[PDB]
Amino acid sequence: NECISVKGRIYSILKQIGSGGSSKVFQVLNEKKQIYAIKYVNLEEADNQTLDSYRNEIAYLNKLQQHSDKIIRLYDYEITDQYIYMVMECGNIDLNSWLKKKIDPWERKSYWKNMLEAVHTIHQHGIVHSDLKPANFLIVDGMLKLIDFGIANQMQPDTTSVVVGTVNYMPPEAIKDMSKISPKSDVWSLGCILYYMTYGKTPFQQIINQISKLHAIIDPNHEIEFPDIPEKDLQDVLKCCLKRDPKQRISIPELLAHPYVQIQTL
Numbered sequence: 001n002e003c004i005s006v007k008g009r010i011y012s013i014l015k016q017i018g019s020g021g022s023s024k025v026f027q028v029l030n031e032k033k034q035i036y037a038i039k040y041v042n043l044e045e046a047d048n049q050t051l052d053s054y055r056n057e058i059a060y061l062n063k064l065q066q067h068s069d070k071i072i073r074l075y076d077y078e079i080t081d082q083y084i085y086m087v088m089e090c091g092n093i094d095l096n097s098w099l100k101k102k103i104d105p106w107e108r109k110s111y112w113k114n115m116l117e118a119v120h121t122i123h124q125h126g127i128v129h130s131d132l133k134p135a136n137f138l139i140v141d142g143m144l145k146l147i148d149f150g151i152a153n154q155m156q157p158d159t160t161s162v163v164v165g166t167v168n169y170m171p172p173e174a175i176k177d178m179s180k181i182s183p184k185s186d187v188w189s190l191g192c193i194l195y196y197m198t199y200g201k202t203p204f205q206q207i208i209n210q211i212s213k214l215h216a217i218i219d220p221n222h223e224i225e226f227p228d229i230p231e232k233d234l235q236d237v238l239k240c241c242l243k244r245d246p247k248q249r250i251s252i253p254e255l256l257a258h259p260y261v262q263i264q265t266l
């Protein structure tokens with residue numbers, strides 16, 4: 001029965017999808033019984049940094065949905081000094097949750113097109129995400145749609161039996177730069193996702209120790225395995241995305257002219 005009004009519309013809370021720092025996301029129904037997601041942010045306590053991060057996400061979300069429908073839509077929002085409410089397109093599920101249920105080749109290359117389109121358009125407006133991973137994409141309408149820009153607070157799914165970030169998607173440049181960053185590091189992370197989507201695992205999901213994992217990612221003399229497969233253009237895509245040198249890695253504009261994307265059958 002718990003409810004939320006935003007501007008002058010009432011919405012019913014079916015459940016809570018997820019939560020993060022000071023944020024919650026709810027699955028809700030509007031008055032005419034249509035389904036939406038609402039993100040809630042409690043601003044009561046909040047640095048001037050995160051305030052600006054939350055303001056920055058809303059503006060980019062509003063700016064970017066005009067240019068692609070592979071970005072989750074922001075329909076309405078309400079922002080005061082105390083709270084934010086954001087009424088948004090509601091996904092069926094996030095791609096990370098879904099991948100952990102163990103893909104038709106054609107759904108896989110359609111999803112890939114979806115991700116490139118979304119990441120390409122945020123690149124055209126000056127954003128490099130930097131921490132792309134499956135959780136950033138939502139399945140809706142049989143498509144993948146991007147939900148974050150790396151900018152704001154990364155939330156996590158709520159379970160109903162209560163229970164930690166991943167690192168399998170981090171590009172080599174990010175690691176070696178602990179001692180601005182390229183559009184090319186989003187290519188790395190997308191390759192890991194596509195790799196996962198094709199070989200059932202991320203390129204270093206075996207190295208269960210995390211510092212030896214970090215070293216593999218950066219190691220020139222540590223080969224990534226690309227088992228032969230029927231779709232050889234999919235093999236090529238993975239090979240070029242997962243080049244360690246960002247300068248030699250394939251770019252998004254190149255990926256969009258690649259045969260895996262352009263020739264429509266396997």
Ligand SMILES: COc1cc(N2CCCC2=O)ccc1Nc1nc(NC2CCCCC2)c2c(C#N)c[nH]c2n1
Nearest residue numbers: 017018025037088089090091092093094097155156157
């Ligand atoms: C019923 O919908 C879902 C269900 C589930 N899950 C996961 C496992 C079990 C389950 O049911 C996952 C996502 C959705 N849909 C959905 N989630 C969103 N956020 C989640 C938060 C936690 C991290 C992922 C993204 C948003 C959003 C924002 N911000 C704008 N629109 C959205 N839509």
